Amino acid sequence: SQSIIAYTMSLGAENSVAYSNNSIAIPTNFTISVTTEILPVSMTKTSVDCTMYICGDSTECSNLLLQYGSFCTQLNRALTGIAVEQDKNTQEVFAQ
Amino acid sequence: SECVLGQSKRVDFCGKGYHLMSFPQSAPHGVVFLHVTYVPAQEKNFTTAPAICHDGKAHFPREGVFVSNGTHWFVTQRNFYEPQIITTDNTFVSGNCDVVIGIVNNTVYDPLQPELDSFKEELDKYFKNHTSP
Amino acid sequence: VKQIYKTPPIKDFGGFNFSQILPDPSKPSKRSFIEDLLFNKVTLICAQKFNGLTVLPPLLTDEMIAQYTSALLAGTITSGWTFGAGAALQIPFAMQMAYRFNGIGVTQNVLYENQKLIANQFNSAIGKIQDSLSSTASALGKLQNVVNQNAQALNTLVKQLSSNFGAISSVLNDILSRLDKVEAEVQIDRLITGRLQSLQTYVTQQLIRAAEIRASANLAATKMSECVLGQSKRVDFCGKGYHLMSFPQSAPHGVVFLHVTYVPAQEKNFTTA
Amino acid sequence: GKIQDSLSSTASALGKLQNVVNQNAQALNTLVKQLSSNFGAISSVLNDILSRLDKVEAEVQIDRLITGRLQSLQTYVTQQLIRAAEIRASANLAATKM
Amino acid sequence: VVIGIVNNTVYDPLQPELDSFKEELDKYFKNHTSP
């Protein structure tokens, strides 16, 4: 007796406010509410040895890879930069 | 920085409602904030007037708002219904009452007058006693 | 807001005129006048579609965004900022302006002794918006480029299908028709290489633009949180001058904030101690 | 006056600016160094490829050269776009602080 | 200690309020000397 229904979404319970040029609403009681809020601060540091990944333990492959210029160095530098930025994030968040 | 090491007046930045304080907590690759906030709960209706004209002059609340339950007028703080007698200490005068739209008539109690009247009654009793010898 | 507020039928706002930012029922959608001008001022394809490039409709249709904007504006005008922090509390709009003036360090009496004037300026001020947005077109440029770029890249992504990338012919059907399998492969694979580089570039550009738009949308959400649902003491955040209040308005792929602010006008010299 | 002592003595204080410059220079320098790699072609200088090889056989090495160099510019442009986004974030923070 | 202070009178609202009472008291005394 359960089924998949499709419908126009409801924006919220309509609530007309009794506005008046001389009417005021003032609370006589309060609630102290605690709300949780989750925020990512960092991510797992990763390092990829470009030569090891592309040409694992093969010198014939490394000879061809070295013809491609500084691509592997650029990738390694980018990943080390990300790794350093992770610790910088953690320091600036938690070490106040 | 704003929510934990202090209190933020920014609306809906440190949790919903009027922010009171906050708690940081660690989490796997992240942080969890417990925002402790004040939220008004039970509102009541009142008849309000932007000003009060008592001695020809207009009166405005130093802090809060004017309210009336239909029979008496009080001044109360904005976010909590704590009515108090309209006194010269709680209000300030600004001009007369012909230009303010929506001003209403209500007496403004001045705490100095009862003290002076008690002193005057004491003085009158002392005079009457002095007429006896 | 979890609640959709409705403006009261009577419009006794103490002289303040919101008929230009509130929705009007004459329109089949609940848009206001300024929002309706904004949707016309921004120009919001098949040949893109047949190559596998599909545009998806937004989750919230413009009618729902207009409803949300109307609810926010009604809450702002009938309850001040109290509807953002919790239960919605009705309050006369003149008293709300007195609250705002008290917020900016001006004693509230200054409002009441000048209310008829302050309305007449504000009612005129909103009117100046109508003249401003209807005459000049570059004002909404902040949105137009956001459209054009997304179009332009798409067009470029289509144009990349016309390149040879070293193959003898730029049409895959032509390659299949003229060449046998072993020799057709050496052209087809070049075609995949080039077109896959093209999609790599397009997806990277889209990711970067999406990050920029996410930053801008987070800024817009922040401005909605403080400027609209409250009053911001941050200097030059919610408009120029001492911020008083704000109005959100929808627009094609964007939001328009009308920041109503207090600006001192005529000053006199005095000797101070 | 203490600032006068702080900035004039140590140099790492302005590091948050220096790393902005150096990276760009490095991002340029590597982009220049990419012109020295063969990318599989028999010679790195395109003039050598044109001089030693006829217009039929030269094309296969030249195409390798364009492939490699265009990939290099694509990487450089992507890195520049990401760095420009970061600098825009820092500039917006600076504008807010102002 | 304050630099730039200037001389000016500061009006206390209690002084005239008490001075009116003083004049009323003086008139009452003078009237009491009449019978």
Rg (CA), chain D: 22
C-alpha to C-alpha distance for B91 and B72, rounded to whole angstroms = 16
Going by their DSSP bridges, the two strands B52-53 and B104-105 should be labelled as parallel
**Which phi and psi (to 5°) does residue C163 adopt?**
-85, 150
- What's the DSSP call for residue C227? I
Chain centroid to CA B127: 42
Q: Which residues of C touch E9 (CB under 8 A)?
A: none
CB C236 within 8 A of CB C242: no
C-alpha to C-alpha distance for C153 and C201, rounded to whole angstroms = 10
C-alpha to C-alpha distance for C46 and C147, rounded to whole angstroms = 17
Alpha helices in C114-178 (DSSP H): 115-135, 141-159, 172-178
CB C158 within 8 A of CB C53: yes
Helix (H, G, I), strand (E, B) or coil at A94: helix
Q: Which residues of B touch C115 (CB under 8 A)?
A: 101
> How many residues make up chain B in this entry?
133
Q: How many CB atoms lie within 10 A of CB B46?
A: 21
Q: Which of C1, C86, B15 is nearest to A37 (CA)?
A: B15
Nearest to D85 among C166, C204, C212 (CB): C212
> Across the interface, do C4 and A12 touch by the CB < 8 Å criterion?
yes
Going by their DSSP bridges, the two strands C3-6 and A13-16 should be labelled as parallel
Q: How many CB atoms lie within 10 A of CB C142?
A: 12
Encoding tokens for residue C188?
């087809």
DSSP string, A17-80: ----TTEEEEES-EEEEEEEEEEE---------HHHHHTTT-HHHHHHHGGG-SHHHHHHHHHH
> Across the interface, do D89 and C215 touch by the CB < 8 Å criterion?
yes
Instruction: Tell me which H or E stretch contains D52.
Output: helix D46-52
CB C238 within 8 A of CB C261: yes
Strand partners, A31: B39
Angle (nearest 5°) at CA A20 between A15 and A21: 150
C-alpha to C-alpha distance for A81 and D86, rounded to whole angstroms = 13
State how far residue B113 is from chain C, nearest Cα, in angstroms: 26
Nearest to C68 among A11, A22, A26 (CB): A11
A27 touches chain C (CB under 8 A): yes
C-alpha to C-alpha distance for C89 and E35, rounded to whole angstroms = 67
A15 touches chain C (CB under 8 A): yes
Nearest C-alpha in A relative to C67: A11
Residues 6+ apart with CB under 8 A from B85: B74, B109
CB-count burial class (<10 Å; 0-12, 13-18, 19+) for A20? middle
> Across the interface, do C237 and D81 touch by the CB < 8 Å criterion?
no
Counted across chains B and C, CB pairs separated by less than 8 A come out at 76
What experimental approach yielded this model? Answer: cryo-EM
Nearest to D85 among C204, C208, C237 (CB): C208
Residues 6+ apart with CB under 8 A from B35: A34, A35, A36, A37, B3, B14, B15, B19, B22
Angle (nearest 5°) at CA C15 between C14 and C17: 120
| Dihedral angle of Cα C87, C92, C97, C102, to the nearest 10 degrees | -70
Helix (H, G, I), strand (E, B) or coil at C41: helix
Q: Which of C73, C93, C33, C58 is nearest to C224 (CA)?
A: C73
Interface of C with E (CB under 8 A): 273
C218 touches chain D (CB under 8 A): no
C-alpha to C-alpha distance for B29 and A43, rounded to whole angstroms = 6
Residues 6+ apart with CB under 8 A from A27: B40, B41, B42, B43, B44, B79, B80, B81, C87, C89
Helix (H, G, I), strand (E, B) or coil at D74: helix
Q: Which of C113, C91, C44, C25 is nearest to C254 (CA)?
A: C44
Nearest C-alpha in A relative to C6: A16
What resolution does the deposited structure have, in angstroms?
3.7
For residue B38, the one-letter residue type is: Y
C-alpha to C-alpha distance for D85 and C194, rounded to whole angstroms = 27
Q: Which of C15, C231, C242, C263 is nearest to C115 (CA)?
A: C15
CB D42 within 8 A of CB D64: no
CB C89 within 8 A of CB A27: yes
C-alpha to C-alpha distance for C187 and C175, rounded to whole angstroms = 7
> How many residues make up chain D in this entry?
98
C-alpha to C-alpha distance for B22 and B36, rounded to whole angstroms = 6
Strand partners, A85: none
Helix (H, G, I), strand (E, B) or coil at C216: helix
- Placement of tokens 């090891």 in the chain: A52
Angle (nearest 5°) at CA B87 between B84 and B73: 50
Nearest to B29 among A30, A34, A40 (CB): A40
Gaps after residue numbers in chain C (C–N over 2.5 angstroms): 44
Helix (H, G, I), strand (E, B) or coil at C60: coil
For residue B40, the one-letter residue type is: P
Q: Which of B61, C82, C30 is nearest to A19 (CA)?
A: C82
Going by their DSSP bridges, the two strands B57-61 and B91-96 should be labelled as antiparallel
Q: Which of E29, A71, C108 is nearest to D71 (CA)?
A: A71
For residue A95, the one-letter residue type is: A
- For an interface test with C, give the residue of A8, A9, A10, A11 to mutate (most C CBs within 10 A): A11
> Across the interface, do B41 and A32 touch by the CB < 8 Å criterion?
no
> Across the interface, do A15 and C3 touch by the CB < 8 Å criterion?
yes
Rg (CA), chain B: 24
- What's the DSSP call for residue C139? G
Q: HSE on the CB side for C6, CA within 13 Å?
A: 11
> Across the interface, do B116 and E21 touch by the CB < 8 Å criterion?
yes
E5 touches chain C (CB under 8 A): yes
- For an interface test with C, give the residue of B10, B75, B81, B96 to mutate (most C CBs within 10 A): B10
Instruction: Tell me which H or E stretch contains D79.
Output: helix D58-97
Q: Which of C217, C258, C252 is nearest to C37 (CA)?
A: C252
A18 touches chain C (CB under 8 A): yes
C-alpha to C-alpha distance for A28 and A40, rounded to whole angstroms = 38
Q: Which residues of B touch A33 (CB under 8 A)?
A: 16-17, 36-37, 39
Nearest C-alpha in C relative to D75: C201
Helix (H, G, I), strand (E, B) or coil at D59: helix
Strand partners, D80: none
Instruction: Tell me which H or E stretch contains B45.
Output: strand B43-47
- Placement of tokens 């911020």 in the chain: C243
Counted across chains C and E, CB pairs separated by less than 8 A come out at 3
C-alpha to C-alpha distance for B49 and B117, rounded to whole angstroms = 31
